[PDB]
Curated annotation (Swiss-Prot):
Function, as annotated: DNA-dependent RNA polymerase (RNAP) catalyzes the transcription of DNA into RNA using the four ribonucleoside triphosphates as substrates. This subunit plays an important role in subunit assembly since its dimerization is the first step in the sequential assembly of subunits to form the holoenzyme. Part of the processive rRNA transcription and antitermination complex (rrnTAC). The complex forms an RNA-chaperone ring around the RNA exit tunnel of RNAP. It supports rapid transcription and antitermination of rRNA operons, cotranscriptional rRNA folding, and annealing of distal rRNA regions to allow correct ribosome biogenesis.
Top-level taxonomic group: Bacteria
Gene: rpoA
Family from the record: Belongs to the RNA polymerase alpha chain family.
Full protein name: DNA-directed RNA polymerase subunit alpha
Amino acid sequence: FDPILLRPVDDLELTVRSANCLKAEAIHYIGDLVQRTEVELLKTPNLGKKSLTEIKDVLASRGLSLGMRLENWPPASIADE
């Protein structure tokens, strides 16, 4: 599995309006991020175009795709509590 992917958009280390705004859209995990749709996500009253280039840079910098449903998400790398 991809580690950055398992990471939370907030801590994904992306921009401030991209990752941050991502966790505000019920997508605190970059996994769900790629498992969504930048079409409507990049049209909210708190998004932007310069952000679509980043979110896409993550969905394309890790062999991912738009709405690319991940395997059995989330992975087993989050079972400590």
